Design a binder for this molecule. Structure first.
Ligand SMILES: CC(=O)SCCNC(=O)CCNC(=O)[C@H](O)C(C)(C)COP(=O)(O)OP(=O)(O)OC[C@H]1O[C@@H](n2cnc3c(N)ncnc32)[C@H](O)[C@@H]1OP(=O)(O)O
Ligand SMILES: CC(=O)SCCNC(=O)CCNC(=O)[C@H](O)C(C)(C)COP(=O)(O)OP(=O)(O)OC[C@H]1O[C@@H](n2cnc3c(N)ncnc32)[C@H](O)[C@@H]1OP(=O)(O)O
Lengths: 430, 430
């Protein structure tokens, strides 16, 4: 196979309610200035990604662009982000010369796995001989509607005919439903999930890019002792299993990554041992049936398939991983992800979180920058963000949450819907 | 490079207002029976495609699935069609064994070029060594809303902030605007575009799959002499340049194609010279800037770039083509497509249509089954339909519209938005 290299990338701040970067009634610039649009975020992400990757002034050597985005058609009335990305380099500079003109571009989608799917597409282009350098960007804007209205948009990721009726907050409810079963089988507890949140917010507190950077929450708060941490669902059956702090954020943001094969490195004037690089040893996608759910809510069968293929293609095992990024769309999902990735055996994610093994100082740090819970979750961006966080830790770029032991191996696990699409990648430092 | 072969495929009937297959108040089964949902169309298309490709009972050898769809999230409240496709083989047969489980799948999107993009993704997977057999299906349901509401959904293909205000029928208006400029430069006429429609409806009349199969229109009717062929736009500046008969249909439908590399043919027990095959010699994508339009409305620069790359990679010229499928989203676009493909020189599409060169009996027949105008336009399906129509002509399957001279070489040209994304492929008979 042709090898694949992460050359560089960019994560915007992730912003929404609770961030000082978000312009609401509590902001100096309220009334004066607006938050970024989808087009603006896409422009910032594309330009930021080119800059960090050392391509400013030679963007014409990028052969192709893939955008990951889930709901731009709903939140921003805008599809067709392929040609949006082609215009993103020189956005708002009318008539300007554009070195991306006529290149291939498209949007890919699998709910919150859209970013990961974007990386896969780019990687297939690189191994197919139709590209030597690709740009994969993911973006999302979700703050243009309430959390309730957004919850109906996010339900586009579920089997909508079958599952929308559970609750206006369809996804939160689907994970609350997992938690009920999880509790009845004593797989792990609501204490355990509160410990996940405490970790995430503590990690976020060290990350200025994080949506929840300025919010502090104690274990006790996340564990429900605060009455402002409401059990907000409407469905009576599942209401008691989910608190606000268990939920990923409604965020706006972008993440981008430039990927290259060996011929692309050559073109950029780079060697395969260049210390700015990280190798993607493997990536893998697994998709289950939208229309049918397994009974065992304590196992994410699809995410487990993806993680298994990826580590296998990389010829490593979970115990070899030094860092991971997992899809904590809820605290409940982070626990399940530990077991789907394999860093915990079935029923033993509880051990890991009770023992601090996934904190910054633990033996397998996870979601070092705050996860979907604190860093935030602009759905389309998440999958690429995960890649870039492992990259940044590997390159010593994470500042206040930088790991003291630079990780040699990392893994990502990105998930769309209720474990219906999963994408997992193994990353090796250089 | 690994070679790529079309093994087989399937087009559903394309249905909507005017079709006897469409169930509205005037239909015997009104109240009794409903039109197909997006899920049902996807199930029919996936199963139909497997059947005609010879894979029934061994669907497990398909390595991957790519779905093309533009607006399912809006018209049907449904995204995440990747796992929908995974469950499409056994749709409505609960608990059944499913040989597609855990395979890679995703949805791709570039407005009305979504189907073509789906083929490109599949083809990259085939050349990348991550697949030997791929299934590319495209589907769309647009009849769940009024034409006016649908026109706002379709505007997701435009630069929405900039262009939505032109008209509720944003896309029709954008092509009407082209026609104004086209008229002022005498590039071609509204008689010429009526001749395109006459050809499409005559072709449709020989195609039972065609939305408009049962509607007959004379040149004179398409040319405006019928008062029911109304100039329906609201925008005063462009209103006079577009008639209803100039417009593609609001259709529901699906198309699917199985593609394979040489190892995939081996796996299916097939030889590369098997007469059921067509080789995709080349495919190419070109994407321009969503945010800026070129001045010259008489040229589709982006579609021309894509056609040029494809014919060049295939080392052929337009004059070598025996058949073509082009993106006649409007009659106006068919004319521009003849020139973008290269079968007419700049300003000479008028010669071709005045001379009958693109009729079934002409030297370069185009859109033999009726095009987006008559066959209809379920947006995500269109790109794959185009591929399958060239295939079917090449394999002698088109019955009443079958070409008497079996074509050796064909080309497709699929377009998203106002010439912002284009995909073009060269096909060679075996
Ligand atoms: C695979 C994947 O990645 S899935 C994608 C996953 N993402 C999601 O599901 C998004 C999850 N996150 C969210 O929806 C948001 O972060 C939330 C809802 C958890 C927090 O949002 P906020 O804006 O802080 O909450 P908000 O104030 O809108 O209120 C939420 C609801 O909680 C309830 N609520 C709020 N405060 C109270 C209270 N004091 N008492 C009772 N109910 C309350 C209400 O029902 C309220 O809705 P309402 O105003 O319509 O009646
Ligand atoms: C670029 C790509 O390839 S992607 C997308 C493809 N392109 C498109 O957008 C085409 C899709 N849209 C269409 O083509 C149009 O929706 C149509 C014209 C085909 C739909 O026509 P129909 O639905 O059969 O007729 P319908 O009755 O809705 O007429 C549409 C509108 O035209 C006007 N109209 C309809 N009938 C009449 C009449 N007898 N007299 C005057 N005006 C009329 C009306 O404004 C009507 O809207 P309204 O009912 O709110 O007033």
């Amino acid at each position: 196979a042709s090898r694949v290299f992460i050359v560089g990338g960019h994560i915007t701040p992730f912003v929404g309610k609770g961030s000082p970067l978000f312009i609401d009634k509590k902001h100096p610039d309220f009334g004066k200035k607006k938050n970024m649009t989808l087009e603006e975020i896409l422009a910032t992400t594309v330009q930021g990604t080119m800059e960090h990757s050392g391509l400013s002034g030679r963007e014409g050597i990028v052969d192709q662009v893939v955008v990951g985005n889930f709901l731009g058609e709903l939140f921003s009335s805008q599809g067709h982000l392929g040609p949006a990305a082609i215009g993103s380099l020189t956005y708002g500079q009318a008539g300007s010369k554009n070195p991306l003109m006529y290149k291939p571009a498209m949007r890919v989608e699998g709910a919150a796995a859209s970013g990961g799917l974007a990386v896969i597409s780019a990687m297939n282009a690189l191994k197919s001989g139709s590209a030597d350098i690709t740009l994969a960007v993911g973006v999302e804007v979700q703050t243009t509607a309430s959390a309730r209205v957004g919850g109906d948009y996010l339900a586009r990721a579920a089997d909508y005919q079958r599952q929308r009726q559970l609750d206006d907050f369809t996804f939160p409810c689907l994970f609350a439903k997992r938690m009920k079963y999880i509790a009845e089988h004593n797989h792990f507890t609501m204490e355990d999930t509160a410990r996940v949140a405490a970790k995430a917010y503590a990690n976020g507190n060290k990350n200025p890019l994080a949506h929840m950077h300025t919010r502090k929450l104690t274990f006790e708060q996340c564990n429900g002792e605060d009455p402002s941490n409401v059990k907000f669902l409407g469905n009576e059956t599942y209401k008691e299993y989910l608190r606000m702090t268990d939920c990923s954020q409604v965020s706006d943001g972008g993440a981008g990554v430039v990927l290259a094969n060996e011929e692309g490195l050559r073109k950029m004037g780079l060697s395969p041992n260049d210390s700015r690089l990280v190798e993607i040893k493997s990536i893998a996608c697994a998709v289950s049936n939208l229309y049918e759910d397994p009974d065992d809510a304590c196992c994410m069968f699809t995410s487990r398939q993806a993680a298994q293929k990826a580590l296998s293609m990389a010829n490593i095992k979970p115990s070899d991983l030094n860092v991971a990024e997992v899809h904590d769309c809820f605290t409940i999902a982070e626990m399940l992800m530990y077991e789907a990735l394999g860093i915990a055996e079935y029923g033993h994610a509880k051990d890991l979180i009770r023992n601090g093994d996934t904190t910054l100082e633990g033996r397998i740090p996870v979601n070092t920058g705050g996860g979907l819970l604190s860093f935030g979750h602009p759905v389309g961006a998440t999958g690429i963000k995960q890649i870039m966080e492992v990259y940044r830790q590997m390159k010593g770029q994470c500042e206040a949450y930088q790991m003291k032991k630079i990780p040699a191996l990392g893994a990502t696990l990105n998930m769309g819907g209720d474990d219906k699409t999963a994408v997992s990648a193994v990353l090796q430092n250089i």
